Amino acid sequence: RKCNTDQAGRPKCPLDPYFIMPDKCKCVDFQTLKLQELPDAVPHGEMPR
Amino acid sequence: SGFDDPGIFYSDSFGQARKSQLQRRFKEFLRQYRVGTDRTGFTFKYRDELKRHYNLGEYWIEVEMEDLASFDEDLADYLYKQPAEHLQLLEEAAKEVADEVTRPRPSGEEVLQDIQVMLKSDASPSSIRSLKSDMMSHLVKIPGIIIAASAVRAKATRISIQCRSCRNTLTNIAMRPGLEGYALPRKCNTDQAGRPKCPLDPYFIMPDKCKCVDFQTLKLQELPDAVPHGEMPRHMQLYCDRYLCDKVVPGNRVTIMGIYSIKKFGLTGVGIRSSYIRVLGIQVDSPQEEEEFRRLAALPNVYEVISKSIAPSIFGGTDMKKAIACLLFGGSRKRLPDGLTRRGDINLLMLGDPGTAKSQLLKFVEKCSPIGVYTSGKGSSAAGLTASVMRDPSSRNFIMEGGAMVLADGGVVCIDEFDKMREDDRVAIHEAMEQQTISIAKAGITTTLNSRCSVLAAAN
Amino acid sequence: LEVRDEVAEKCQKLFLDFLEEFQSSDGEIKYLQLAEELIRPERNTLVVSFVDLEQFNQQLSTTIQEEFYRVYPYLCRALKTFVKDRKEIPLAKDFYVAFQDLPTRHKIRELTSSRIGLLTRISGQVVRTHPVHPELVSGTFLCLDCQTVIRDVEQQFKYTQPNICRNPVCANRRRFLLDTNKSRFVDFQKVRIQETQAELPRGSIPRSLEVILRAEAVESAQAGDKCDFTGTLIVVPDVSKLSTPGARAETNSRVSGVDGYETEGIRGLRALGVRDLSYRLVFLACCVAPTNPRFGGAESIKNQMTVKEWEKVFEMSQDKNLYHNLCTSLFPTIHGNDEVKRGVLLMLFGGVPKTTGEGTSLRGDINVCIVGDPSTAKSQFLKHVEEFSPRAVYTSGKASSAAGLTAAVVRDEESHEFVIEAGALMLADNGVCCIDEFDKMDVRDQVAIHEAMEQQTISITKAGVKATLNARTSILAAANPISGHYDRSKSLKQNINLSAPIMSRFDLFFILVDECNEVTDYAIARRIVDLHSRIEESIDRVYSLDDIRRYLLFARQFKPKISKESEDFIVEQYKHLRQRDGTKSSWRITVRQLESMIRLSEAMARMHCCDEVQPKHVKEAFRLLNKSIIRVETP
Amino acid sequence: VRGTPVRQRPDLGSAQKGLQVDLVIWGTDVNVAACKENFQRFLQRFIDPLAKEEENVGIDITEPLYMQRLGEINVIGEPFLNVNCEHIKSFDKNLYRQLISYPQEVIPTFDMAVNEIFFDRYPDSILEHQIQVRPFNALKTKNMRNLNPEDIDQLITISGMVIRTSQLIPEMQEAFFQCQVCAHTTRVEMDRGRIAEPSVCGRCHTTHSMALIHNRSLFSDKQMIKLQESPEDMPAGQTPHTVILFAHNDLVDKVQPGDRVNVTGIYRAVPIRVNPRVSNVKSVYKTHIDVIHYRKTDAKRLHGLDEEAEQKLFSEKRVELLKELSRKPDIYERLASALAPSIYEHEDIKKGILLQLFGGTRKDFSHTGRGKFRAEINILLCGDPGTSKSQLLQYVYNLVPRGQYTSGKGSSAVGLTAYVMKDPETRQLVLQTGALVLSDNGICCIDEFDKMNESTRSVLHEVMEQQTLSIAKAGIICQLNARTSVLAAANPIESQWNPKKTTIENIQLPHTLLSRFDLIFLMLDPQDEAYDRRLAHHLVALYYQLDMAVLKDYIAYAHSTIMPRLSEEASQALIEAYVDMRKIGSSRGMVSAYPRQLESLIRLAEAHAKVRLSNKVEAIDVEEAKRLHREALKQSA
DNA sequence: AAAAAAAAAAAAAAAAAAAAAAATTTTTTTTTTTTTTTTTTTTT
Numbered sequence A: 001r002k003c004n005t006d007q008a009g010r011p012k013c014p015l016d017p018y019f020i021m022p023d024k025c026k027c028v029d030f031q032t033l034k035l036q037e038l039p040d041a042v043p044h045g046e047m048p049r
Numbered sequence B: 001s002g003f004d005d006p007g008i009f010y011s012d013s014f015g016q017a018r019k020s021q022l023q024r025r026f027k028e029f030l031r032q033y034r035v036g037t038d039r040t041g042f043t044f045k046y047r048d049e050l051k052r053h054y055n056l057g058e059y060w061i062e063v064e065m066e067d068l069a070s071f072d073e074d075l076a077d078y079l080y081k082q083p084a085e086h087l088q089l090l091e092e093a094a095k096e097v098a099d100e101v102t103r104p105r106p107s108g109e110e111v112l113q114d115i116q117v118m119l120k121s122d123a124s125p126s127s128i129r130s131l132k133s134d135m136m137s138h139l140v141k142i143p144g145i146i147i148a149a150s151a152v153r154a155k156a157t158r159i160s161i162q163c164r165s166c167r168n169t170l171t172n173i174a175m176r177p178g179l180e181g182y183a184l185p186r187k188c189n190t191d192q193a194g195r196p197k198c199p200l201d202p203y204f205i206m207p208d209k210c211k212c213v214d215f216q217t218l219k220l221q222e223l224p225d226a227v228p229h230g231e232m233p234r235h236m237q238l239y240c241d242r243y244l245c246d247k248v249v250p251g252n253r254v255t256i257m258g259i260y261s262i263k264k265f266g267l268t269g270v271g272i273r274s275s276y277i278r279v280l281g282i283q284v285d286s287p288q289e290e291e292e293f294r295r296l297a298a299l300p301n302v303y304e305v306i307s308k309s310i311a312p313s314i315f316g317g318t319d320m321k322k323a324i325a326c327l328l329f330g331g332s333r334k335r336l337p338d339g340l341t342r343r344g345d346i347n348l349l350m351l352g353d354p355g356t357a358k359s360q361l362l363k364f365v366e367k368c369s370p371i372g373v374y375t376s377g378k379g380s381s382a383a384g385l386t387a388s389v390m391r392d393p394s395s396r397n398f399i400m401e402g403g404a405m406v407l408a409d410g411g412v413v414c415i416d417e418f419d420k421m422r423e424d425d426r427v428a429i430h431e432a433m434e435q436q437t438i439s440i441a442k443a444g445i446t447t448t449l450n451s452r453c454s455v456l457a458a459a460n
Numbered sequence C: 001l002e003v004r005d006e007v008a009e010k011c012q013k014l015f016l017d018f019l020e021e022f023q024s025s026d027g028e029i030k031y032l033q034l035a036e037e038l039i040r041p042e043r044n045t046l047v048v049s050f051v052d053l054e055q056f057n058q059q060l061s062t063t064i065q066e067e068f069y070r071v072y073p074y075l076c077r078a079l080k081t082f083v084k085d086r087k088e089i090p091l092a093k094d095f096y097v098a099f100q101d102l103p104t105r106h107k108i109r110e111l112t113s114s115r116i117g118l119l120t121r122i123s124g125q126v127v128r129t130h131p132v133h134p135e136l137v138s139g140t141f142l143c144l145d146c147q148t149v150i151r152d153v154e155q156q157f158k159y160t161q162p163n164i165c166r167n168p169v170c171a172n173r174r175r176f177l178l179d180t181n182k183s184r185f186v187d188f189q190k191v192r193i194q195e196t197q198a199e200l201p202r203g204s205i206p207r208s209l210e211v212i213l214r215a216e217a218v219e220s221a222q223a224g225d226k227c228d229f230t231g232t233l234i235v236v237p238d239v240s241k242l243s244t245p246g247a248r249a250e251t252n253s254r255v256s257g258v259d260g261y262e263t264e265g266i267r268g269l270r271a272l273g274v275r276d277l278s279y280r281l282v283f284l285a286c287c288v289a290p291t292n293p294r295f296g297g298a299e300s301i302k303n304q305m306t307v308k309e310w311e312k313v314f315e316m317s318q319d320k321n322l323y324h325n326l327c328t329s330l331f332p333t334i335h336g337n338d339e340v341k342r343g344v345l346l347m348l349f350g351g352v353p354k355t356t357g358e359g360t361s362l363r364g365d366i367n368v369c370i371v372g373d374p375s376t377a378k379s380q381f382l383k384h385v386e387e388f389s390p391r392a393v394y395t396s397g398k399a400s401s402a403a404g405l406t407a408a409v410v411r412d413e414e415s416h417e418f419v420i421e422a423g424a425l426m427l428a429d430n431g432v433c434c435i436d437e438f439d440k441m442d443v444r445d446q447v448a449i450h451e452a453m454e455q456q457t458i459s460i461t462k463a464g465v466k467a468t469l470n471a472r473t474s475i476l477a478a479a480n481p482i483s484g485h486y487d488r489s490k491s492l493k494q495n496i497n498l499s500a501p502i503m504s505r506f507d508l509f510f511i512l513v514d515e516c517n518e519v520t521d522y523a524i525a526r527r528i529v530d531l532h533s534r535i536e537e538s539i540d541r542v543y544s545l546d547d548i549r550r551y552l553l554f555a556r557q558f559k560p561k562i563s564k565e566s567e568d569f570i571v572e573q574y575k576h577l578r579q580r581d582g583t584k585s586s587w588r589i590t591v592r593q594l595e596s597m598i599r600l601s602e603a604m605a606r607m608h609c610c611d612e613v614q615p616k617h618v619k620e621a622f623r624l625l626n627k628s629i630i631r632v633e634t635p
Numbered sequence D: 001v002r003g004t005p006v007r008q009r010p011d012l013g014s015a016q017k018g019l020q021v022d023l024v025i026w027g028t029d030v031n032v033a034a035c036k037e038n039f040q041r042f043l044q045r046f047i048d049p050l051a052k053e054e055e056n057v058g059i060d061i062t063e064p065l066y067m068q069r070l071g072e073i074n075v076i077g078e079p080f081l082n083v084n085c086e087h088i089k090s091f092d093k094n095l096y097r098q099l100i101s102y103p104q105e106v107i108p109t110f111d112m113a114v115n116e117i118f119f120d121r122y123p124d125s126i127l128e129h130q131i132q133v134r135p136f137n138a139l140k141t142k143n144m145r146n147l148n149p150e151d152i153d154q155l156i157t158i159s160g161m162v163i164r165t166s167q168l169i170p171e172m173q174e175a176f177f178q179c180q181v182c183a184h185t186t187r188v189e190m191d192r193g194r195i196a197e198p199s200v201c202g203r204c205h206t207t208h209s210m211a212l213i214h215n216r217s218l219f220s221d222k223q224m225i226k227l228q229e230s231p232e233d234m235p236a237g238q239t240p241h242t243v244i245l246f247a248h249n250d251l252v253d254k255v256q257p258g259d260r261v262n263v264t265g266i267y268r269a270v271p272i273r274v275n276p277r278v279s280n281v282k283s284v285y286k287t288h289i290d291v292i293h294y295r296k297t298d299a300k301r302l303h304g305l306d307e308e309a310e311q312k313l314f315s316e317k318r319v320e321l322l323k324e325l326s327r328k329p330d331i332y333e334r335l336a337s338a339l340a341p342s343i344y345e346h347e348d349i350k351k352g353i354l355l356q357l358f359g360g361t362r363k364d365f366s367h368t369g370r371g372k373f374r375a376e377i378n379i380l381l382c383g384d385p386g387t388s389k390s391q392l393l394q395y396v397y398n399l400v401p402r403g404q405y406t407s408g409k410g411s412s413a414v415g416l417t418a419y420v421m422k423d424p425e426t427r428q429l430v431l432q433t434g435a436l437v438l439s440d441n442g443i444c445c446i447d448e449f450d451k452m453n454e455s456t457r458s459v460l461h462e463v464m465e466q467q468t469l470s471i472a473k474a475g476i477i478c479q480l481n482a483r484t485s486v487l488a489a490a491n492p493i494e495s496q497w498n499p500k501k502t503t504i505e506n507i508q509l510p511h512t513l514l515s516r517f518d519l520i521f522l523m524l525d526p527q528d529e530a531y532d533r534r535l536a537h538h539l540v541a542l543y544y545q546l547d548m549a550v551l552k553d554y555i556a557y558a559h560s561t562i563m564p565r566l567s568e569e570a571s572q573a574l575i576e577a578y579v580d581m582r583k584i585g586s587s588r589g590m591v592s593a594y595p596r597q598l599e600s601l602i603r604l605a606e607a608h609a610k611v612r613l614s615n616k617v618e619a620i621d622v623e624e625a626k627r628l629h630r631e632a633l634k635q636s637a
Numbered sequence E: 001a002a003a004a005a006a007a008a009a010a011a012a013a014a015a016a017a018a019a020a021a022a023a024t025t026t027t028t029t030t031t032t033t034t035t036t037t038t039t040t041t042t043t044t
């Protein structure tokens, strides 16, 4: 929320000063799967969880 | 197409009188106050005043409350009851009428400066004891003696502030006059689409682009005669502004007209707000004359009439009158190409029995000279006979205490009891009476103060 | 200093006098006797008659009719005094006053703005009814800048926060937290009604408006009814109804904007409190009655019967020849077609639905089909049934997509719930649906009504709501033969193009051949021309339409047995019917025809309001089926 | 002024400041005093020179015209004075320019003038509010697409067809505020479209204690009328164009869909907010009209149902002229020849169309139980694409009020009955009606009826049978009215009436639908040589080229006054006629008779009775019905 | 070969997810200016 320098100048850094540096982020692969209950596992009248 | 934002435009107005009409009636007062009788020939006093002052580069005028009431009674009542904003209207009227009278001004002064409309009344003053709460924010008139006058510091009437991110400006905000503060805005209004906004407190006060005017914080004190028997004198601050600065000095006895007020610095002895008087007006307690004096030169018995008239009540001593007239006129100074100074003052001494009118004659000469100081040989009460330089502890400025010899420069010092004076004073006057320059070389600095007085000395 | 509404308080005084001093013809204070019943729970309104108002005091009556909105809470508090003084009710309970029997009447086209805020009554067909909810009337709030509670702020048909915090040195207009327990609500149902078919202008869609039903007049309306409503026309605030700027409120304070905060744009509008004022008419029904009431009020309905109508239906039941009398009364216009008359009458009476121990829902309704050559009064019979009965919905062929045919879905515009909009089968529930051009229904929906006929129920699961809607309606179908003309040398299943299961489900089938026989032709011509020349007379319905309609409603609740002798006759006669089947009929005989015959025997017992189906009924039912089923005529 | 308040005028719009400039109102030269006196001068002096007693009904012509209008106002009690912009133009031009160019102020000056004259006369009458002038018949704006923005906030007259009318929209007028501390009340009139809320009580002085109470504030009406312009000058390749009208207070609901109107109103251009919620507005401005006057009178069309219902519509001399026309011997043929002069000698066809225009006797049936009964006539015109059946349908569509036109499979059942659409103006799923419902109480002219696929032909059965219509869908579940008369134009199979095919197969329409119809004219080609020559001379004369007014008056009077009832002679004639029709109908090659054809004979007898203004249907009527129903279908041949 | 029925396509309308957008002064610290007091050094 607040820059931590104590040396930004005679004035201070504004409120919420940080912008994410996109290039300097090291990232990974991720995947949102939609797993559905096993059809033989589902009880008779219910619906697949 | 959406890359610009051209400004708004508006037009002149086509079609309890409103403040704009009070502005109009102040404009009428200035433009039409006719003072000169039809027998005496007429003149528009304030139109001529604005013209002359604005040409000179004075930017102020002096409007009498009596004239205001005579031309328009309701305006006078309005200024007495609610001076502040109605004074603002009056200043705007002075600006506009100034523009009218000097509309085709030459180049180099194209901008129209503001005008300070000082006001002076003739109503007898109230008393500092009588400045109770009910008389507050109404124009009050007060006598007093100033005792301390601070230095003229620059205070801002209109400012501009830049945004730290977008670098756009809020040019020419108006600072409310007085000792009135101003909280900065906390949002950059300049919104740009599809972009993150400027930060929370974006604004920094651009110092290059402001309008600033002087101001002086004086201290006024109850008139010592006006104080009751058992009572300490009352005091009041004053806030002199833009041409009331340096119009007075400490020690001067003055009458003021101003708005009894309060210091407005935020909502930060419960409920008390330190108070002052935003002073509007100050008073301090020809060819005809030149022709009279030329005739007086032309007279045969100018010597005799002056001699008689300087001691009309002092019996005898006609020769004494002669010599003292010669003194009061004084000789003449010369500064040859050698680089030296030749004294022009005439110095007289009266070594007399304790009966004659020595001290009375001195009192006459101090009254009758323009710049006259009557001092003993040991100075006067809390007032030295000769200047003294001091180095301040805190600011290490040179505080010069001025005595008789320097206060009364180009005039007469009546040194009563010349036969008793301190040795340091004696050694000072030894050269202050033939060089007229008192030299003081303290651990700080060398100075050669100018004591160009004439010594009328009285002793037993 | 609590300024008083002088006229409203005088109205409170005079109406309190009316309540406590108006006495019936018998001499007792009728509204004291009615206010006796508000002590009970689940009851918070009196029903005061506007004619009584007029008789007691014309001045107060005209004042209420002209200033109904302003006086309404005052009349409610007058009732509160009138009941609290006598009985020891809970102090917090609120009360209401319901007007009826109002002399004047208006129309949904007549409900103009000048009628705002003053009493008015209209008629309408209740399209749909949203669920019951608690609605906030008087709210208690808490200001979140000084924690002072602001008490009893009124809700003007919108969630209203207090206009400014009651504390003088706190100008909170934004941050308020509702204190739910301290606030008081009113039970509330929103319903949609539309213009009655009689009142349509030329080329005009039926307008529809929303009617709010406050406490105790809340479930009285129902979808499909024909209800008169009485109450105020109010205006409920709307917002963002138009894309063009319109009338907008704003404070009259002359504030300006300082530099850097200038009251412009969004900041400016929020500062001045600008808000559009877009409204919409929303009727506020104070009371609701059927527009054509059945009664002035089997054992419960019998108690509801007045003495005159009770003896009328009694002598109706005791009447013999009621059979042909009902035929004539239902169909004075028709000539001949006695088999169709009989079948449709029995259809109106219906059979007895039953259900097995296992859970098989035996059908009780009896569906009829009229098939014949063109211009043989088929659509006329369906129109007669429509115009006669209540809960008699009508539709024709390809004029009804399936969603409106059976059921649709909408989301509650107020809450999260969903309103299951009622289709033709639902509106015909426990009644009749007259389907015309039945043969020309798409498969997609003819299967839907087939499901309705099999199960008496349709379960809709669509667009985020599931429900199992009941529809016990009976179907009267009209079916044009293939080629336009019926062919007696072919079987019925190849004359028409219904699905085999649909044809199986159909209980009765009538064949109307347009043969050219001139004695009959003279009869028909004389009949219809007589009708046209003498419209108003030339009808001799021996029992009025209201009389027989009441008789149907009263007869419906009698459920016949089947005695052992009648059962013996049933089985032997079905055996004889199979012997006939064993030449050949145009549509073969199965066990479904046994089912049809027993249901029609039940419906004849229902016509005579018996508790036992007798051989008379069985014989007549068999005769009906035997004459319905015809021999295919090969040359 | 007799203590009679001047009423709010929402039509003129939000009032302006009314600033005065010394050279009138700012930017507009009107000279309110000059306008008021000029309008008084017009209102006394004007005597219409070239007018007609037929036009001005019940008005002494030589006597002061608009003062007699004021007298009608006094006796009736309707404070509306319908002034004619052409009268104003004829009397003086500059006043008319003032009215056309600056209506927004020129109207209240006229109302002030008219009230001055009104209580100069009649200082004892009672009126519910002051008199409101309503100008009309401006210079007809031929093509509204040609309206520049230099014509914004002027007065215009357009002609169109009302397609939609919204529900009532309230309009705040007197914001009634109540303090929530001391319950002090106040009222703020609509200042300039805004409600300056009081912001401080006037009795306890608390700030922002005053809440607006909605349903104690008085309101007005407003209704959005969606109209499509039917200009008389269509440029090249310009599609037609809907337009939005706003009708205020008493003008609400006085025009129903399908009604062709001449609407006179002030043009308006309004901003449109970019989103529903934001306050930015597009620099492009949508426009609409605020409506002062409805006028449902046009020379080329018959009197609408409103003019039928009104009583004081024909002078005594005009009704007597109608009576003696009824006494004329051959009035049936006179009117038949009067219909469609540009078509040659189709006397039977034009007699049928005439009977259709007359209709029959709309018979009440409510307590009979029979349900609604079609009292109208349906006609089919069967022929190859050489005859002029399309010409007849075009002519009847032009000539009728509440006409609608369809051709072939350029339609559908959904767009014929109704559909659900998001209105662009309110963002609401409103319901819209199709052609059959639009032409509710008039004529639907269907062309190329054979090429009408089964879905969009099966809906016509409902209309022709019941006069009702059902739309049971997810949109709404209701039952609209559609009491139209169908004028169908069909073609035989393979576009030619070949001889070696009976009539029903050559037509090839469903037999039930042909039963629905009430007359079926087979325009075979007569090969006759003299007919050929007369037709040829007729068309070439059509190149080298009764009154519509008397026709309209006779038809409208017949509708208004005389509803025939059967006579016993006619009933016996009808029974005999139908049994004879069935007896000839043994041969089913022709279109066999039905009880529906008996009903058709009933209706045609009633139509002949109305042609005679009979009030009693007689054997002459029934015999003409038989003869027409035989010559149509050509059952002799 | 043309009509009827069914399937697919095109286009408008609605429901939820997740990324964007907007609002937004007051109290404490502490340096600097000023005054005051005790002492030592210097002068009478």
Ligand SMILES: Nc1ncnc2c1ncn2[C@@H]1O[C@H](COP(=O)(O)OP(=O)(O)O)[C@@H](O)[C@H]1O
Binding pocket: B313, B314, B315, B353, B354, B355, B356, B357, B358, B359, B360, B361
């Ligand atoms: N020669 C004189 N003429 C007039 N008044 C005199 C004279 N001598 C003394 N006095 C009076 O005596 C008083 C003392 O005068 P002052 O000049 O003070 O005497 P000194 O000069 O001796 O002190 C004064 O009030 C004055 O009026």
Ligand SMILES: Nc1ncnc2c1ncn2[C@@H]1O[C@H](COP(=O)(O)OP(=O)(O)O)[C@@H](O)[C@H]1O
Binding pocket: C333, C334, C335, C336, C337, C373, C374, C375, C376, C377, C378, C379, C380, C381, C524, C527, C528, D465, D512, D595, D596
């Ligand atoms: N037996 C009859 N009795 C009375 N009216 C009849 C009879 N047969 C036919 N009609 C007349 O025929 C008209 C149309 O019959 P309708 O049933 O609508 O034909 P469809 O069965 O093709 O719809 C009815 O309005 C009715 O007056």
Ligand SMILES: [Mg+2]
Binding pocket: B358, B359, B416
């Ligand atoms: Mg002395």
Ligand SMILES: [Mg+2]
Binding pocket: C378, C379, C436, D465
């Ligand atoms: Mg039918």
Ligand SMILES: [Zn+2]
Binding pocket: B163, B164, B165, B166, B167, B168, B188, B189, B190, B198, B202
């Ligand atoms: Zn910025």
Ligand SMILES: [Zn+2]
Binding pocket: C143, C144, C145, C146, C147, C148, C165, C166, C167, C170, C171, C172
């Ligand atoms: Zn608060």
Ligand SMILES: [Zn+2]
Binding pocket: D179, D180, D181, D182, D183, D184, D201, D202, D203, D204, D205, D206, D209
């Ligand atoms: Zn109040």
